[PDB]
Design a protein around this nucleic acid. Structure first.
Ligand SMILES: [Mg+2]
Ligand SMILES: [Mg+2]
Ligand SMILES: [Mg+2]
Ligand SMILES: [Mg+2]
Ligand SMILES: [Mg+2]
Ligand SMILES: [Mg+2]
Ligand SMILES: [Mg+2]
Ligand SMILES: [Mg+2]
Ligand SMILES: [Mg+2]
Ligand SMILES: [Mg+2]
Ligand SMILES: [Mg+2]
Ligand SMILES: [Mg+2]
Ligand SMILES: [Mg+2]
Ligand SMILES: [Mg+2]
Ligand SMILES: [Mg+2]
Ligand SMILES: [Mg+2]
Ligand SMILES: [Mg+2]
Ligand SMILES: [Mg+2]
Ligand SMILES: [Mg+2]
Ligand SMILES: [Mg+2]
Ligand SMILES: [Zn+2]
Ligand SMILES: [Zn+2]
Lengths: 59, 169, 109, 50, 292, 54, 188, 117
RNA sequence: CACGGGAAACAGCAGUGAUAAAAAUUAAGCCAUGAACGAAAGUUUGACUAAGUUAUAUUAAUUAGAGUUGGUAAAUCUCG
RNA sequence: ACAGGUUUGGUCCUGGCCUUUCUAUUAAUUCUUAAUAAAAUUACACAUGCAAGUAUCCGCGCCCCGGUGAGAAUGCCCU
């Protein structure tokens, strides 16, 4: 890979990222599916933390 | 080995066969014995045979020996708690010192088998890696799976240049 | 309960080599190390510095060294715990009577 | 509703343990609350709860 | 009633029936040979070494537990039919934790139908062999258990090796285990070859397929052919335990019981061919008349 | 034994140097976040703002 | 001779030539020193040519490599250790070494050729079929009513205010394509 | 080696014989190399279907939930596997890619029936 | 050890002089994985994937050429 | 090492040197194809291209992967 102190390309300069298109149905649907997803997952995570506490402090 | 007058004790086998293992409290061990007498006899025998086995099995434990200081032979033990154990060895047979030391600070054969079991479960059959740590490696090997392309060149389709020559054209 | 010394040294038996510094004993420690070629154990020695409060150690003594929780100097990791054998004066731990070599100076009766 | 394989797991272990109560495996979403991404994050320090 | 192999009656009787032959028990193995070690012994120490050889031969004579046939398990933990559209081949997920008993493991399958189903017994077996490799076990099923190979092997009188094949390769409650076990007992029933497995640990399998299938024929005839009275009487005792209420059982029991009485009565009330059992119980009796 | 004795004096020098020069040359936010509106180009950071932010 | 192996090994030509001794009994390999190159020659038989002093196997073309003959494939495997012989032991070329290995393997696999199979105890120690993994669990309240396992496996068409603000944000870049998910897959 | 930062990450390390890939579920550091050093082996994955047509995955769930229990992050395909397994909820982009495929199947059934005409 | 000084850095991927007994493509994509950001679609990645070049090593056939023939050590005749 | 040749008119003894085994480079002679792997003289100088971006600002990242073995008896192991 590159490094901090390396010079940037001549072809990378005049180019800033052009975003991908958005679709409303799919998008909102996704914000929800994901919202709920990391919801149940951040739940199972705290569950696993309770597990770790249990194993260790019962050790 | 020829030289030495009981070379069988410089064997690797004789070092792993002799059994006493020391607790985690025992750190220093002093052996104080006498040169001249028929009353120090088995002790010198204990030095000349068993100290080898002890020491091998107990590397981090310092063992020392003092000759002809005190008129009668003994063992001294210095533990982590500052507990100083004293084992009087006089007319004792070699084996009696062995098994009495085994008695005082041993480790239950149970404890040993449990510990070694803890270390054997550390080696897992299911994993995959270099031949050093595990058995199987890339699963070129395992039965139902795909034979890896070194041994058995795969069908023409599954090749990358086939998929690219088909995608381009 | 935290008081520790990171040194493997936690307890040692060692001879007293020298008195040459103030309140500090120079102690010879002797371990059995295995030579892998011959399969044979020899005495490898290490010179340890110890702190004595009494300045009590004559040269040639047998001394029990206790680890010090916090190092004093670079070279002082230890404390004289107890004197196991005094040089020229030894009391039998077994019978508690004074001795020189194999000779009881004070016998029973 | 605990995810299918993990549900079968909890059911199997509470079954082998000797507990026959068939009650559903209910998970609590109580502490899982997440702010949406427009929520400004405080830049101060790391809070140490003593 | 509750008769089973692991009951102390069936166990002590199969133990006294099996017999210990230290020659067949401890046999030359085709393993890489090492040089023999020697020692000089007293009489006492020779008897001690004998009792020791017998004591290890006991644990070598340990019988593989017999088990009835498991019932194939199909259960669906979940369904999502949006995942059916993936159109990919089966995913198989296996739980490996060293502590968990292999009966307690979770073997999972996700199909192109996008449903979560539990794997079958043969699939569980071959997965637990892939990820917990065990020696004697072939992940892909052996060609040797085909009937051609099996029969060509039986001609070689190798029955103990096929029985041993099945002990390692498959599982005690599986289908093919009981299949080729009972098939083996069949092909030792047709050739009268029972005495092969005499000193073998597979004897219990013989007596416990044959007391249930209710042909005690060749076993009793080969027991009174070798002039062993106590083994035929103990076999009749077994058919008396696993079948308590029947004509032969309670009649030839309540009437009277001994070697001659119970053996001759369970010879005439066991009707497959009683002529050979009565002719052989006539033969060991005339030869018990001649030698004494 | 294992003993490696060796000084490094300029390992600290560069630290004091970089730190003091850092606090003295620390950019005030006036020129820093200052932006050229036509090119959408930051003179200070050389960082061109994203296409959704114009 | 055709494929049938037992024919020549029972034969009088064989019993005359090799006698009762094994094949390779009289064979000797010729090399640069007292120590033979650590694995023998690749293939002795090439194109139409057989090279020099041929192997015990391939000098006589009446001998066939198959998994059928116990007779031919016996002497190339040790009696007492029951292990195959590497090519330097016997003297056979390596092609035939590999062919013999696969042969003897396919011989032991069909039960034609003996080997040692040890006593191995049963897999499990205790068998309990009673576990919740083996026996069918109590299928969930989400299974009996056929419900998707979570609220979000079912596609919900969003409110129009939310979608029109979602257009209001993305206005220049927006690609708006209706998202109803046709329920059954198949196609040509 | 010694890094500036980074997290414990459960991911897929790629070993391979080139055109027959094989994966190892592995507990590691984020900034260390792909197949490189790791804390503990967790599981494995087999990309190519076998004689019975089965892509094979071995997972250790006790240690998976111990490491996820100690604050580990999971990679995208690790959530594909753990989601499909049922130990986790199905990832949203599985159902999203589902939707994409379903709609492209209807659009191309309509393409097949527009071409047949 | 870089505050400073010489001075203007491929010991990243390609490629090029000089030098050495030592000679891969100034090649294609982020499709798989890992990484960086991201709420998220996703964007980038000479890591990597798939190629391309080489008898440098194994596998396999389509492919026959090299060394040797006093002794150790397999194998020789007539001339010069 | 299962050892072999080689001191003397000759025999032992001591004793090096060499051969027979396996691997890697380069070279000379030859070489049909594909597959798998590995690709390396040179801490000598470097033409041209590219290897760090992402993202509603800020921010996060930018020898992390990757290269090399120059240097240092450096260091493995173990607190
Ligand atoms: Mg500077
Ligand atoms: Mg380069
Ligand atoms: Mg650079
Ligand atoms: Mg050049
Ligand atoms: Mg590029
Ligand atoms: Mg390649
Ligand atoms: Mg070559
Ligand atoms: Mg080759
Ligand atoms: Mg040619
Ligand atoms: Mg010759
Ligand atoms: Mg001379
Ligand atoms: Mg001469
Ligand atoms: Mg002379
Ligand atoms: Mg020479
Ligand atoms: Mg070359
Ligand atoms: Mg090269
Ligand atoms: Mg340079
Ligand atoms: Mg490195
Ligand atoms: Mg390196
Ligand atoms: Mg030095
Ligand atoms: Zn492979
Ligand atoms: Zn040949």
């Amino acid at each position: 890979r590159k490094t901090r102190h390396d010079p940037p390309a001549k072809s990378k300069a005049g180019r800033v990222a052009t975003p991908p298109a958005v679709d409303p149905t799919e998008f909102f649907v996704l914000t929800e599916r994901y919202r709920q997803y990391r919801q149940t997952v951040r739940a199972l995570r705290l569950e696993f933390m309770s597990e770790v506490r249990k194993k260790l402090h019962e050790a | 080995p020829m030289k030495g007058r009981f070379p069988i004790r410089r064997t690797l086998q004789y070092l792993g066969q002799g059994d006493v293992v020391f607790k985690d409290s025992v750190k220093v061990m002093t052996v104080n014995y006498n040169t001249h007498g028929e009353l120090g006899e088995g002790a010198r025998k204990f030095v000349f045979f068993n100290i080898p086995q002890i020491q091998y099995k107990n590397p981090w434990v310092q063992i020392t020996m003092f000759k002809n200081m005190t008129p009668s032979p003994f063992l001294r033990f210095y533990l982590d708690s500052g507990e100083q154990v004293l084992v009087d060895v006089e007319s004792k047979s070699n084996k009696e010192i062995v098994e009495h030391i085994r008695k005082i600070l041993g480790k239950n054969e149970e404890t040993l088998e449990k510990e070694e079991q803890e270390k054997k479960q550390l080696s897992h059959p299911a994993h995959f890696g270099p031949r050093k740590y595990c058995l199987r490696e890339c699963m070129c090997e395992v039965e139902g799976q795909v034979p890896c392309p070194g041994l058995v060149p795969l069908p023409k389709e599954m090749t990358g240049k086939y998929k690219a020559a088909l995608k381009a054209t | 309960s935290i008081a520790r010394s990171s040194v493997h040294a936690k307890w040692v038996v060692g001879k007293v080599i020298g008195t040459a510094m103030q309140k500090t004993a120079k102690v010879r420690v002797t371990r059995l190390v295995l030579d892998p070629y011959l399969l044979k154990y020899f005495n490898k020695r290490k010179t340890y510095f110890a702190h004595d409060a009494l300045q009590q150690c004559t040269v040639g003594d047998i001394v029990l060294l206790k680890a010090l929780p916090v190092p004093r100097t670079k070279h002082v990791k230890h404390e004289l715990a107890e004197i196991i054998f005094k040089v020229g004066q030894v009391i039998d731990p077994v019978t508690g009577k004074p001795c020189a070599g194999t000779t009881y100076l004070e016998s029973p009766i | 509703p605990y995810p299918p394989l993990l549900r079968a797991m909890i059911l199997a272990q509470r079954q082998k343990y000797g507990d026959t109560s068939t009650e559903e495996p209910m998970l609590n979403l109580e502490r899982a609350r997440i702010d949406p991404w427009d929520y400004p994050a405080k830049l101060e320090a790391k809070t140490k709860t003593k | 009633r509750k008769p089973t192999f692991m009951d102390e009656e069936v166990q002590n009787i199969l133990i006294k029936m099996t017999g210990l032959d230290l020659q067949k028990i401890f046999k030359p193995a085709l393993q890489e040979l090492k040089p023999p070690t020697y020692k000089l012994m007293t009489q006492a120490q020779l008897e001690e070494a004998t009792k020791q050889a017998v004591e290890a031969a006991k644990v070598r004579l340990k019988m593989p537990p017999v088990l009835e046939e498991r019932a194939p398990i199909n259960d669906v933990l979940a369904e999502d039919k949006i995942l059916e559209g993936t159109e990919t081949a089966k995913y198989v997920f296996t739980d490996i934790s060293y502590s968990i008993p292999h009966r307690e493991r979770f073997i999972v399958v996700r199909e192109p139908s996008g449903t979560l189903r539990k794997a079958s017994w043969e699939e569980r077996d071959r997965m637990i062999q892939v990820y917990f490799p065990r020696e004697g076990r072939r992940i892909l099923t052996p060609v040797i258990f085909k009937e051609e190979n099996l029969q060509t092997m039986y001609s070689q009188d190798q029955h103990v090796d096929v029985l041993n094949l099945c002990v390692a390769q498959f599982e005690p409650d599986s289908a093919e285990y009981i299949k080729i076990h009972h098939h083996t007992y069949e092909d030792i029933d047709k050739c009268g070859k029972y005495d092969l497995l005499r000193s073998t640990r597979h004897f219990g399998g013989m007596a416990w397929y044959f007391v249930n299938k209710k042909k005690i024929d060749g076993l009793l005839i080969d027991q009174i052919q070798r002039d062993l009275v106590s083994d035929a009487t103990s076999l009749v005792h077994l058919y008396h335990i696993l079948h308590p209420x029947x004509x032969x059982x309670x009649x030839x029991x309540x009437x009277x019981x001994x070697x001659x009485x119970x053996x001759x009565x369970x010879x005439x009330x066991x009707x497959x061919x009683x002529x050979x059992x009565x002719x052989x119980x006539x033969x060991x009796x005339x030869x018990x008349x001649x030698x004494x | 034994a294992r003993k490696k004795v060796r000084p490094r004096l300029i390992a600290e020098l560069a630290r004091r140097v970089r730190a003091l020069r850092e606090q003295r040359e620390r950019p005030r936010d006036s020129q820093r976040y200052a932006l050229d509106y036509e090119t959408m180009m930051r003179p200070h950071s050389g960082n061109r703002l994203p296409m959704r932010a114009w | 001779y055709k494929d049938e192996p037992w024919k020549y090994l029972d034969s009088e030509e064989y019993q005359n030539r090799y006698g009762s001794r094994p094949v390779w009994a009289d064979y000797r390999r010729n090399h640069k020193g007292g120590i033979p190159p650590q694995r023998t020659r690749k293939m002795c038989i090439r194109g139409n040519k057989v090279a020099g002093n041929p192997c015990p196997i391939c000098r006589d073309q009446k001998l066939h490599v198959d998994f059928r003959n116990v007779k031919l494939l016996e002497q190339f495997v040790c009696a007492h250790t029951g292990i195959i012989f590497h090519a330097p032991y016997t003297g056979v070329c390596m092609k035939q070494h590999k062919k013999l290995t696969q042969a003897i393997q396919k011989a032991r696999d069909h039960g034609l050729l003996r080997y040692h199979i040890p006593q191995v105890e049963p897999r499990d120690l205790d068998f309990s079929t009673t576990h919740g993994a083996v026996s069918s669990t109590p299928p969930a309240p989400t299974l009996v009513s056929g419900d998707p396992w979570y609220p979000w496996y079912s596609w919900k068409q969003p409110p129009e205010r939310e979608l029109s603000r979602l257009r209001r944000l993305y206005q220049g870049r927006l690609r708006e394509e209706s998202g109803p998910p046709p329920e059954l897959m198949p196609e040509v | 080696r010694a890094y500036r930062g980074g997290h414990l990450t459960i991911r897929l390390a790629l070993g391979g014989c080139t055109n027959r890939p094989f994966y190892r579920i592995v507990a590691a550091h984020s900034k260390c190399p792909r197949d490189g050093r790791f804390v503990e082996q967790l599981g494995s994955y087999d990309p190519l279907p076998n004689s019975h047509g089965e892509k094979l995955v071995a997972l250790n769930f006790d240690r998976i939930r111990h490491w996820i229990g100690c604050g580990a992050h999971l990679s995208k395909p690790v959530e594909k596997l753990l989601g499909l397994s049922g130990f986790y909820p199905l990832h949203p982009m599985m159902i999203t890619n589902a939707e994409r495929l379903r709609r492209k199947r209807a659009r191309e059934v309509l393409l097949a029936s527009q071409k047949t005409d």
